[PDB]
Every structure is written in structure tokens, then in C-alpha cells.
Design a protein around this motif. Structure first.
Motif, mmCIF file in Angstrom:
data_model
loop_
_atom_site.group_PDB
_atom_site.id
_atom_site.type_symbol
_atom_site.label_atom_id
_atom_site.label_comp_id
_atom_site.label_asym_id
_atom_site.label_seq_id
_atom_site.Cartn_x
_atom_site.Cartn_y
_atom_site.Cartn_z
ATOM 1 N N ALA E 116 0.720 -1.287 0.000
ATOM 2 C CA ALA E 116 0.000 0.000 0.000
ATOM 3 C C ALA E 116 0.754 1.349 0.000
ATOM 4 C CB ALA E 116 -0.983 -0.083 1.122
ATOM 5 N N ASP E 117 2.085 1.359 0.319
ATOM 6 C CA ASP E 117 2.977 2.563 0.225
ATOM 7 C C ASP E 117 3.718 2.612 -1.087
ATOM 8 O OD1 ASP E 117 2.223 3.077 3.018
ATOM 9 O OD2 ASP E 117 3.906 1.912 3.680
ATOM 10 N N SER E 118 3.528 1.694 -1.999
ATOM 11 C CA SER E 118 3.703 1.920 -3.444
ATOM 12 C C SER E 118 2.575 2.763 -4.037
ATOM 13 C CB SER E 118 3.943 0.616 -4.283
ATOM 14 O OG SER E 118 3.745 0.985 -5.655
ATOM 15 N N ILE E 119 1.414 2.128 -4.144
ATOM 16 C CA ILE E 119 0.176 2.666 -4.578
ATOM 17 C C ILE E 119 -0.084 4.075 -4.100
ATOM 18 C CG2 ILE E 119 -2.352 2.209 -4.896
ATOM 19 C CD1 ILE E 119 -0.334 -0.181 -5.930
ATOM 20 N N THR E 120 -0.200 4.262 -2.802
ATOM 21 C CA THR E 120 -0.513 5.660 -2.336
ATOM 22 C C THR E 120 0.521 6.765 -2.578
ATOM 23 O OG1 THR E 120 0.184 4.998 -0.150
ATOM 24 C CG2 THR E 120 -2.113 4.965 -0.372
ATOM 25 N N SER E 121 1.814 6.533 -2.885
ATOM 26 C CA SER E 121 2.768 7.423 -3.604
ATOM 27 C C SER E 121 2.185 7.842 -5.017
ATOM 28 C CB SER E 121 4.146 6.748 -3.852
ATOM 29 O OG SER E 121 5.070 7.710 -4.099
ATOM 30 N N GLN E 122 1.725 6.855 -5.851
ATOM 31 C CA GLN E 122 1.425 7.030 -7.287
ATOM 32 C C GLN E 122 0.487 8.246 -7.659
ATOM 33 O OE1 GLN E 122 -0.258 3.121 -8.495
ATOM 34 N NE2 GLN E 122 1.637 2.159 -8.562
ATOM 35 N N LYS E 146 1.381 -15.677 -2.551
ATOM 36 C CA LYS E 146 0.681 -16.692 -3.418
ATOM 37 C C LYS E 146 -0.771 -16.243 -3.824
ATOM 38 C CE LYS E 146 2.742 -21.065 -1.667
ATOM 39 N NZ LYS E 146 2.167 -22.305 -1.133
ATOM 40 N N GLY E 147 -1.284 -15.172 -3.273
ATOM 41 C CA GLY E 147 -2.490 -14.413 -3.662
ATOM 42 C C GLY E 147 -2.746 -13.109 -2.981
ATOM 43 N N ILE E 148 -3.403 -12.191 -3.641
ATOM 44 C CA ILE E 148 -3.705 -10.822 -3.185
ATOM 45 C C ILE E 148 -4.879 -10.284 -3.922
ATOM 46 C CG2 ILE E 148 -1.766 -9.732 -4.750
ATOM 47 C CD1 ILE E 148 -1.470 -7.673 -2.376
ATOM 48 N N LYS E 149 -5.720 -9.678 -3.112
ATOM 49 C CA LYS E 149 -6.877 -8.793 -3.364
ATOM 50 C C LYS E 149 -6.726 -7.370 -2.890
ATOM 51 C CE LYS E 149 -11.234 -10.169 -4.249
ATOM 52 N NZ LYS E 149 -12.278 -11.164 -4.228
ATOM 53 N N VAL E 150 -7.282 -6.422 -3.678
ATOM 54 C CA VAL E 150 -7.029 -5.001 -3.506
ATOM 55 C C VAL E 150 -8.377 -4.290 -3.725
ATOM 56 C CG1 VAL E 150 -5.373 -3.101 -4.189
ATOM 57 C CG2 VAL E 150 -4.776 -5.535 -4.640
ATOM 58 N N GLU E 151 -8.737 -3.343 -2.860
ATOM 59 C CA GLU E 151 -9.891 -2.467 -2.917
ATOM 60 C C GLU E 151 -9.410 -0.981 -2.702
ATOM 61 O OE1 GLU E 151 -13.287 -1.433 -0.111
ATOM 62 O OE2 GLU E 151 -13.920 -3.374 -1.109
ATOM 63 N N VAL E 194 -10.472 12.501 -0.643
ATOM 64 C CA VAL E 194 -9.689 11.321 -0.280
ATOM 65 C C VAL E 194 -9.381 10.331 -1.351
ATOM 66 C CG1 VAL E 194 -11.557 9.987 0.580
ATOM 67 C CG2 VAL E 194 -9.386 9.767 1.781
ATOM 68 N N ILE E 195 -8.353 9.508 -1.157
ATOM 69 C CA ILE E 195 -8.157 8.221 -1.901
ATOM 70 C C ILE E 195 -7.686 7.028 -0.921
ATOM 71 C CG2 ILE E 195 -7.038 7.021 -3.769
ATOM 72 C CD1 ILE E 195 -7.343 9.269 -5.674
ATOM 73 N N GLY E 196 -8.579 6.215 -0.437
ATOM 74 C CA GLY E 196 -8.292 5.247 0.645
ATOM 75 C C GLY E 196 -8.186 3.807 0.109
ATOM 76 N N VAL E 197 -6.983 3.250 0.107
ATOM 77 C CA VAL E 197 -6.680 1.855 -0.255
ATOM 78 C C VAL E 197 -6.532 0.752 0.852
ATOM 79 C CG1 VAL E 197 -4.044 1.822 -0.391
ATOM 80 C CG2 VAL E 197 -5.393 0.618 -2.021
ATOM 81 N N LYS E 198 -6.924 -0.506 0.498
ATOM 82 C CA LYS E 198 -7.095 -1.737 1.331
ATOM 83 C C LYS E 198 -6.557 -2.966 0.614
ATOM 84 C CE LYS E 198 -11.455 0.746 1.443
ATOM 85 N NZ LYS E 198 -10.891 2.069 1.729
ATOM 86 N N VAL E 199 -5.974 -3.850 1.443
ATOM 87 C CA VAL E 199 -5.433 -5.056 0.858
ATOM 88 C C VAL E 199 -5.752 -6.272 1.682
ATOM 89 C CG1 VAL E 199 -3.443 -4.177 -0.663
ATOM 90 C CG2 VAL E 199 -3.032 -4.679 1.719
#
Lengths: 105, 150, 127, 98, 206, 96
Positions: E116-122, E146-151, E194-199
Motif C-alpha cells: 500500500a505505500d507503493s500505490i498511495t505514492s502514485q 501466493k495471492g492478493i486482493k485489492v480495494e 480522499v483516496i483510501g486503499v485496502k489489501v
RNA sequence: CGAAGAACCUUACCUGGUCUUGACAUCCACGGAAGUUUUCAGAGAUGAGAAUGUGCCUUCGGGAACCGUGAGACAGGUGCUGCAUGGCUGUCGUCAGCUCGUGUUGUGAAAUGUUGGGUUAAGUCCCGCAACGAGCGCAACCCUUAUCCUUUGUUGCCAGCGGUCCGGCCGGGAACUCAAAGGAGACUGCCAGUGAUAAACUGGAGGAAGGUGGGGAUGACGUCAAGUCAUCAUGGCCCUUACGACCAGGGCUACACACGUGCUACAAUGGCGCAUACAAAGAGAAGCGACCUCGCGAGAGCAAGCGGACCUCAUAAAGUGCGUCGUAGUCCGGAUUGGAGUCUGCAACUCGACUCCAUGAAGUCGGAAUCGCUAGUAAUCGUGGAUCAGAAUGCCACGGUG
RNA sequence: UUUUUUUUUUUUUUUUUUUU
């Protein structure tokens, strides 16, 4: 292959005795399947249903002992012959069981 | 409802070892307090024997013959309206249901004491005169009759 | 020489001691009749020991820590049973067959939310 | 009958404690008690450390919370001094107020 | 329809604490006022490389702050004048000294937070973050998991536009209390709101 | 009434033993209805706003007086959180 | 209703007094020791006087503990939408859930495992079937039992003796309750019958339960587009001369009407009078409080005590034994109104809450038809708790004559 | 392949923007 399967409560091990049941009778000549088969040998084209379709889909050779009810257009080698029981497929299986071992050379 | 569990077991009377004399009182109780209700029922059976000077508790039967029914009417609208058909009561039921009509006759009876409201109506019940016996005979006039309409 | 038990029933809290010969029933310093004098259950405590001819053979001594007479009649049942339960192993079949081993433990799967009866699952003849 | 109410967060740490008091104190007098319990509070404990408002993460722990009774017949200092010299155990409590 | 934490419910089971301290009956209240204050100074001093774990221990109420940051060399600075500031400002609120312990965030690719501190830099570029978002996820999973979901939720278009976007580069069994899973979140802005990300990161099965 | 009155409790909250509850320990015992002296009481009731006991109280973790639970030490809205850090030890699955 | 206290009362609103940084709270600027006590006004906020007072370091710098007056930034509230969403709780569901990571007969809203033979009360379980298995609901941990095994002995506790000045009083030892820590045992376990020697159903040996043993309990997706929109945790949007905050008053309850919840009161399966036999759930230092002094008593007072078997509230009601009416509008009916009393308060009176006597409204067993209540379950027989300066008739929970 | 246990119970306004 060792003793380690008789783990946990006794009804945990038995709940796989009874998988092994439901599966080695259907599956006991294919236990590895780490690549896709190259060829097939079939004795019914009714009772064996799905296998002939999967084979013709993917382009496999099919060796087929067939009667007056058959569909010969769906195979690579017909052997016209009495459909069922031990005497028929006996009279063919000697020479199959031969060629698939002495033919390794 | 698939399992056999459908009736109370109870224990016998303190004197004559009979679940008869025990179900009597345990029908008569209506408000709880058992052991003094059981001593007042024991007082009914002595006031009884003042008539005759012997084991009138043997004549308890010779009254209970007239109060026991064979039949009872329950929910049977089957045939598009009320279609009764009582069915008989199983052997075990004949005398508990007789205790039910002895206690409803005793409630307003009018006799001096409650020992005497029961011991007099048992006396009448042997005479077929009784108000417990009249209720039974009503059902016999009713549903044992309606055998012929079923 | 002596044999013993204790009970818990509606709501008492009683003990009982079996003792050598003379056949009597002594609650602290008094007789059975003084303690249940009208109390219609009273026979049930002396009944299973009058089988085994108690009168020259046993003696029974009692004491009590919250009375409870209508419930005591079974606290004593269970207690006097634990005492005979080392007197003679033979009678465990008599005590059971006569109900004299049984003790209060059961509700008949009763109500929790609304329904009367509450363990049994949906039943059919082929749904 | 001076009731020293011994108490530890754990069964572990009062066992370690009490078994010296029933030895040490008793050597010349008073028959010193030490195992006899009080209503030991084996409860279920729940704290919210959930990194956002979502479902659960209220991690339910258990506890032991275990108290006993040290009891002495008289203030006999030639037997009892030894438990009072045990002041150095700053990781168990005792509540002697009576 | 749920958000269901794997972590938090499990402090002693593969998934270790954000913080832990023992303050007593009449000494908690100030410790709790300090647990947001000490984390606010640090997580703004350490922003230049993030902090996967901002760990508050308090060995004798004096505070053993263990900072797993992806560049410790920039918070050691030119050699330890920042450390001095870093051990004073969090000790200025708490009234006690502060046992500053440093660490690396060992590979941000496989990490429990730093995806999430990749993404929220972008978002600090304001232009087509869509070019890089799902690529950052891809990149991370190429060194581990081995898996990941992102909202991602927020004002991420123009004028008035406000939506939520959901992606899945691999399978995630949402809660399995035995597994090496994590949940995390982070935040960003874009001058409209805002822009709020979740993993959810299913890294392993146990 | 949010913050309101705190200042005027504070201004006399510590000296009620000096407005009565020690001032009393000789003159006011003869002033009882047990001991009869009828001219004496009518000069000690003068303290009005600081006559003990009278206390507006302070709900503290809550900033405004939405009650005060005098068994637990918190506002009539707060309770939920006790169950979530240790403050009410008896609060399991309610009996209802 | 939300109010578990709509006459200081957490203020709706009727009124007036007042303000719009208000009441609370910072960043510099110029300054100060903080407070005890009394007099007089005012309904309260607030107004006019009088005495006594002066702390800790200490570069006498800087200030603290701690009160000011000037600035420039500058404070707030259940206002609701479930519908930005995520916790939470429900009645369904104690159904053994639906769908997918793949494949593919259906283009796709068709479940596609329900087919086709059978079986069991049972999606029970034998197969058969183009179907896998992934695994978060699963196998279950959970608490209280209850019955024990050891270690054990407690304000407990007294099994067998040791003294009795008849009180477990204090000597004296560990049966066992009590207390309870760690825990630990019941399984078709072998017997009668059953049928497919399947299936599981009865009675039992053997028990503290039995075929979830019971009583608590966890309540997965799916939960009605139902809430907690009156602490939610917060996106979108809110009133701002205003939905912002300080203060003493008042009146909510009328009554012709309902209409029911919740009450009882219609006399013996009853009570009335003196006398006799047994339990406890729970509460307690903004405490609870005996004996003992004062009694027509609510109600005054002294004062041993008590921190969790020690102090006190209950001396549960029936029941038993002897007396007492005679079926009687009464001896019971407290609906109520003559006068007689107090614990609290600024405050209860046109507003109570309760104590002593004097009373005596309906009274007499009323039908039409809202659902109470299947078992240890409504009659029946009682107790507590907090909100809170504090009177619910609510509910909430376990006990038992039944 | 006999299938009448009463016939009826106003409107709305539910619908969390869109290109894929």
C-alpha cells in the motif's frame, strides 16, 4: 507406505481409508498422471460415453472392438467383433500386451 | 414427536399401596400444597366408613364402576364439518378420567366440609345418583350413541 | 464397622451414618417421627433396610444442615444408598430395580426461545 | 487465626510462593495453612486492538487469578519472623489487614 | 459484503503486535494519550521510506520504540544527529526516556504493509495512476506471496466523480487463523478529496 | 448545562467540613431535636450554596453530564467499552 | 415513550434575564504571589462594602503552583440519510449453506451435483451420475454441572473421645458435606426382543445423566432493502442572530370518553385468633448496620461490627395443634375521607411518597370472544437490583408446595 | 374426468451518476 497415516483420533485415519476406497477402484492404474496420455484402447462406445468425445476433441488415436450397433466414423482402428464378456477381449489382448513391451526397442 | 415419552409415572398412596387413591388426590389438588390435601383425602375415606362400619375403600370400586367411561371427544372436523367419532380411551385411562368428573362435582358441591363433598359424592356415585356419574352418562348419551352416525 | 453418605435435593444438605446393631433412626438427638410427624413420605427411608433384617444388625444416625423435608426424602435416598454400597455389593441390582439408586439430573429437552420441545430435528416420511 | 490472603496473576507464581511459607514459618509452633482456595477468577478477557472498525479482532484470552489463605494460630516471632523477612518477593501480594 | 480482519484476533499466532505495554490501575491514561502522539511524530519523520511496523514497547514505561522502516540509513541520517531528536521528541511528551531501536523493512515486495505505500505514492503525480497501480501489485507478487486482493475508494477521477475499484491477482481465503495472510490499509489525496486503499495478502497456507 | 456550573462547585467543594461538618462538633449537638436548644440552629443554615451535602458532580471521560452511574464511575451512554478493556468485570452475554 | 424520576433536576417548552469566540481551550504581549473570611443587595447569572493573608526553586535571571487585562488566529449541535461504508443486534436456521479456482452440455437470466435404481424418521447411506474438490460455516473447543480422585483444609468443622459452668463452648482428629485447585470418568458397554446378524428402537445389566444426558453457549454466506441514523466508527450533505451556552421561576398529570395493559376485591379447596416445624437466590464504605436505649408507631438514637460462609435485612408462604364464627353485605372489601403524624427539600401544594385511629364506593360469581400455558411450564409461594441528591405496579433472573 | 370455507382491502414514493 509407512505407519504415519494412523495419526490423530482413529476416525480421522478412517475418513481417508474411505477416500482410498472411493478412489483406487476408479483410479488405481493412473496414480501419477504428470503428463497428458498420447493414445487410447476402448471396449464400449455407449457405457464409456465421455472418453471418446475427450479423445476426438484433442486428437488422440482410439483402438475400438465394435458391433452392429457402433459408430465407426469416431475411431482410428475399428476391430469388428462381439461387444462384451471375457472370451472376446481375451482373443485380442494377448498381442496388445505383447506389442506394448517387446515394441519398446 | 417420534419417541415414546408421553405420560408421568407417579408413586402409590401411603397406606394401601395403590396409585388409584394417589391419582384421586393429585386430581383434587387444583392449587398445589399436597401433603395436607393427602391427609384430608385420608379423612374422606373414614367419613365414608361411618355409613357401614367396614372396608368401604373396597366399595371405592363399586362407585368408580359408574364414573368410568369407554369414550372421549377430541378435534375431528375431518368430513368438511364436526365428524365425531370419539374413539375409546385405552385401559389405563378409564379411572383417571373418572377422578376428573369427581373433582369438578366437588368444587361448588355445597356439603359442610371438603372431606364430605368428596365422601358423599362417592356414596352417590355407587347409587348412580351422582353428579360425577351424570357427566359420564352425558358422554354416553353423546358420543357412544354417535357410533351410529360415524 | 461404619458406612456413609451425603445428599443434595430440594434443597438440602443432609448426611447419614450406618452403625453396629439395635436397628434405630436418630436425627441429631431425636426420632424419625418427631421430624416428619405428618409428612406422608416418611416410610421411604426405612423401607430398603427392613428387607436385610436391620433390627439386630444395623443402626442409623442422621444430621441436617438446611432441613428441607419434601426434598430431604431423596437426599437421604442417595446418601443411605452410598452407605449400603460398601456394606454389600450384592444389592446394587436391588437398589437400581427399586429406583433407590436414581438421582435428579434430567430435563426432557425443554424450551430455550419459544418452542416447548427443543432437541429433535425436522422429521418427515420423505420430504 | 491471622489470615494472610496470598494472591498471584498465575497458579505458577503462588505455588512457587506458598510452599516456602508453610515450610519456613511452621518450624517451631503454629500449624501454618497455605493451599486453601478462594473463588479463583479463570475469566475470559477481551480488548479492542483492531487496526480499522471491521469484524472482530477482539482477541479473547483466558486468565488464572488465583488466591489462597496462609493462617497462623499466634504472633509467635521465634516461628513467624521468617515470612516477614520474605519482603524481597516483590512479584506476589499478601493482604495481612485483619 | 464484509471486510473481515485476519490479523488482530491472533496476537500470539504468526501475526505479532503493533504495540504492547504493562501500565497499572492508575497509570494507563497518559500511556494511551502518548501511544498516538509518539506514533504521529515518528510516522511523519519516517515518511521518507514508510514504517511497516511502528512498534511501541515500554520496558519500564520508558519507551523502546522499534521502527522497521525501509531506509534506516536516512533516519540515522549523516550519523546519529537525527537519532538524538528521534529519542527526545517522543520522550518530551511521555516524561520518560526512549530506547530507539532501528531496523530494515526486509524486501517491501513481500511485506505485511509496504505494498500500500507503493500505490498511495502514485497519486502525487496526478496523471493516469491506472498505468502503474495493478503493475505495482504484479511487481510485488513477483518476489513473494501466493495471492492478493485489492480495494481502492475515493475522488479518483474529475469534477464530482467518486467510486470504488476491486482487483484480484491471486486467490485469498479471507480469514484462515492458521495462515501467513495479512490485512492492511493506507491513504492518499488528489486535490478534490480522499483516496483510501485496502489489501488482503494470502502469502501462505500455514 | 454542558460545562455550566463546575467553577461554583470547585469554589467551595473542599471546605464543607469548614462550612459545617467539623464547625458543628460542639455548638450544633446542643442544637439537635435530641438535646433541645431552640435559639441556636437559625444562624448555621446561612451557607446555602455550600451547605453539605450538595454536589453537581463531574463525568470527566465524557465532557458533559449525560448522567453519572455512581456504582461504575461513568456517563449513562459510555457502557459498551467496559466489556472491551476490563472496567466492568461482570459483563458477559446478558441474562436476557 | 427515548424520561430507570417532563415541580433545583441531563430542559423539550412557558417566561424573563443575558450573550452572541461565548461556557470550556491554545499562540505573544504587558503584568501578578494563591487564597481565607464576613457584612448588605439581587429571583439567579450578577451588584456595593470591610477585614486577614503573601508559600518553592531562585544565576534574583527565568518562572513555577497559579490569577489577570490587550490582541490576531478562534469555539459549537442525536440534523437525519441506512441508499459511501464498516462494526454491532435480531427472527429465520441448529437448514448441515450457497457458490466458485477450473471445465462446459444451456447464447444467458436454467443451480449443472435433485438425474436413475434402492434405502433411513434423517442430503441417513448403498450406488449410480460428465465431476471435481478449494475451504473460510465442518469433525469442536466452550461454561455450569453432576459423580468422583488426590492434595486438602478455611470464618469452615465436627465422623470417634475429651471436658461441659449445656454455648462446637474449646479441648481433639480427619469419615464426608461444605470450599476448590488440578482435573477425571459412560461405551451399544453385554443382555432380552426386534430386521436385512443392515437399520436403529424398547426394556434393562451397569448408573450421577443416556442415546445433543441436561442446563448455559457460539447464531458463519443468507438475515426485512428490518435497524443501533438518541455514545455508533465515519464518506456525501447540515444551523450559524443560529439546531451555538449561561440561570431562578412555572405547568405537564385535567375530564364527559375509553381500551387495553397492569391491579385486585366477590368468605369455608376460605380465613380469623394464639401457639408450633424446615430454605435462600442476591446487595454493601457517595456503604450496610445488630444488641441496646425510646415507642400508638412510620420515625428518633447509642453503638458491637463487616469486606466477602464472621456484621445485619426473612422470624419464605403454605403447613401443624388448640381455639373462634354459622353462609353472615361482614368479622374480610383501603374504593376512599374524618381528623392525627414525619424522612427528605428552596423545593411535593391546587403534585406526592407513607405512618395512627375513625371509615365503608363496587360489593354476590357478569357474556360477547385478545391469546396466557405441554412439564418441571401460566395458576400456586415469595425475595433482590440499579437509573439516582430518588416513590415505577415495569421488567429482568433462579427457586419450590405444585 | 364433482370441485362456490364469504367477496372486497386507494394512489404514490421505494429503486446509492456513467463510458467498459
Amino acid at each position: 507406505q509407512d505407519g504415519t497415516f494412523d495419526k490423530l483420533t482413529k476416525k480421522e485415519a478412517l475418513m481417508r481409508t474411505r477416500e482410498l476406497e472411493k478412489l483406487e477402484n476408479s483410479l488405481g492404474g493412473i496414480k501419477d498422471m504428470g503428463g497428458l496420455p498420447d493414445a487410447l484402447f476402448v471396449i464400449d462406445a455407449d457405457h464409456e460415453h465421455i472418453a471418446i468425445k475427450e479423445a476426438n476433441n484433442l486428437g488422440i488415436p482410439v483402438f475400438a472392438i465394435v458391433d452392429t450397433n457402433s459408430d465407426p466414423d469416431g475411431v482410428d482402428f475399428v476391430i469388428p467383433g462381439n461387444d462384451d464378456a471375457i472370451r472376446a477381449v481375451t482373443l485380442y489382448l494377448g498381442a496388445v500386451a505383447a506389442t506394448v513391451r517387446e515394441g519398446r526397442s | 414427536r417420534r419417541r415414546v415419552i408421553g405420560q408421568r409415572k407417579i408413586l402409590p398412596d401411603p397406606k394401601f399401596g395403590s396409585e388409584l387413591l394417589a391419582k384421586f388426590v393429585n386430581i383434587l389438588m387444583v392449587d398445589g400444597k399436597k401433603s395436607t390435601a393427602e391427609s384430608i383425602v385420608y379423612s374422606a375415606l373414614e367419613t365414608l366408613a361411618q355409613r357401614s362400619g367396614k372396608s368401604e375403600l373396597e366399595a371405592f370400586e363399586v362407585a368408580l364402576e359408574n364414573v368410568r367411561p369407554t369414550v372421549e371427544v377430541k378435534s375431528r372436523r375431518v368430513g368438511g364439518s364436526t365428524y365425531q367419532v370419539p374413539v375409546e380411551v385405552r385401559p389405563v385411562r378409564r379411572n383417571a378420567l373418572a377422578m376428573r368428573w369427581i373433582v369438578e362435582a366437588a368444587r361448588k358441591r355445597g356439603d359442610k366440609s371438603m372431606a364430605l363433598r368428596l365422601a358423599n359424592e362417592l356414596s352417590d356415585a355407587a347409587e348412580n345418583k351422582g353428579t360425577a356419574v351424570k357427566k359420564r352418562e352425558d358422554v354416553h348419551r353423546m358420543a357412544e350413541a354417535n357410533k351410529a352416525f360415524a | 464397622n461404619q458406612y456413609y453418605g451425603t445428599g443434595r435435593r430440594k434443597s438440602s444438605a443432609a448426611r447419614v451414618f450406618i452403625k453396629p446393631g439395635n436397628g434405630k433412626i436418630v436425627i441429631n438427638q431425636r426420632s424419625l417421627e418427631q421430624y416428619f410427624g405428618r409428612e406422608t413420605a416418611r416410610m421411604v427411608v426405612r423401607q430398603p433396610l427392613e428387607l436385610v433384617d436391620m433390627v439386630e444388625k444395623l443402626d442409623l444416625y442422621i444430621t441436617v444442615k438446611g432441613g428441607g423435608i419434601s426434598g430431604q426424602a431423596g437426599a437421604i435416598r442417595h446418601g443411605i444408598t452410598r452407605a449400603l454400597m460398601e456394606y454389600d455389593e450384592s444389592l446394587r441390582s436391588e437398589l437400581r430395580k427399586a429406583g433407590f439408586v436414581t438421582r435428579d439430573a434430567r430435563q426432557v429437552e425443554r424450551k430455550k426461545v419459544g418452542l416447548r420441545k427443543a432437541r429433535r430435528r425436522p422429521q418427515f416420511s420423505k420430504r | 487465626r491471622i489470615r494472610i490472603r496470598l494472591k498471584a496473576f498465575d497458579h505458577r507464581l503462588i505455588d512457587q510462593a506458598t510452599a516456602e511459607i508453610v515450610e519456613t514459618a511452621k518450624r517451631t509452633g503454629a500449624q501454618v495453612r497455605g493451599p486453601i482456595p478462594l473463588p479463583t477468577r479463570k475469566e475470559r478477557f477481551t480488548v479492542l486492538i483492531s487496526p480499522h472498525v471491521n469484524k472482530d479482532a477482539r482477541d479473547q484470552y483466558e486468565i488464572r487469578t488465583h488466591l489462597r489463605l496462609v493462617d497462623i494460630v499466634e504472633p509467635t516471632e521465634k516461628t513467624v519472623d521468617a515470612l516477614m523477612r520474605l519482603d524481597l518477593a516483590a512479584g506476589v501480594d499478601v493482604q495481612i489487614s485483619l | 459484503g464484509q471486510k473481515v480482519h485476519p490479523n488482530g484476533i491472533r496476537l500470539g499466532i504468526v501475526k505479532p503486535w503493533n504495540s504492547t505495554w504493562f501500565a497499572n490501575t492508575k497509570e494507563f491514561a497518559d500511556n494511551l494519550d502518548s501511544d498516538f502522539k509518539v506514533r504521529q511524530y515518528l510516522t511523519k519523520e519516517l515518511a521518507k521510506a514508510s514504517v511497516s511496523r511502528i512498534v511501541i514497547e515500554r520496558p519500564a514505561k520508558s519507551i523502546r520504540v522499534t521502527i522497521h522502516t525501509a531506509r534506516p540509513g536516512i533516519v540515522i541520517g549523516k550519523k546519529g544527529e537525527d537519532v538524538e531528536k528521534l529519542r527526545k521528541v517522543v520522550a518530551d511528551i511521555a516524561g520518560v526516556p526512549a530506547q530507539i531501536n532501528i531496523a530494515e523493512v526486509r524486501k517491501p515486495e513481500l511485506d505485511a504493509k509496504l505494498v500500500a505505500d507503493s500505490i498511495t505514492s502514485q497519486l502525487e503525480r496526478r496523471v493516469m495512476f491506472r498505468r502503474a497501480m495493478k503493475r505495482a501489485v504484479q511487481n510485488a507478487m513477483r518476489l513473494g506471496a501466493k495471492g492478493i486482493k485489492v480495494e481502492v475508494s475515493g475522488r479518483l477521477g474529475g469534477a464530482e466523480i467518486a467510486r470504488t475499484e476491486w482487483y484480484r491477482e491471486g486467490r485469498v481465503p479471507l480469514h484462515t487463523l492458521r495462515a501467513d495472510i495479512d490485512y492492511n490499509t493506507s491513504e492518499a489525496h488528489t486535490t478534490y478529496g480522499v483516496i483510501g486503499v485496502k489489501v488482503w495478502i494470502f502469502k501462505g497456507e500455514i | 448545562a454542558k460545562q455550566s456550573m463546575k467553577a461554583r462547585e470547585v469554589k467551595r467543594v473542599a471546605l464543607a467540613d469548614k462550612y459545617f461538618a467539623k464547625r458543628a462538633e460542639l455548638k450544633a449537638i446542643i442544637s439537635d431535636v435530641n438535646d433541645r436548644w431552640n435559639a441556636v440552629l437559625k444562624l448555621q443554615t446561612l451557607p446555602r450554596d455550600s451547605s453539605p451535602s450538595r454536589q453537581r458532580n463531574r463525568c470527566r471521560q465524557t465532557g458533559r453530564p449525560h448522567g453519572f452511574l455512581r456504582k461504575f464511575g461513568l456517563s449513562r451512554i459510555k457502557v459498551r467499552e467496559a466489556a472491551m478493556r476490563g472496567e466492568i468485570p461482570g459483563l458477559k452475554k446478558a441474562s436476557w
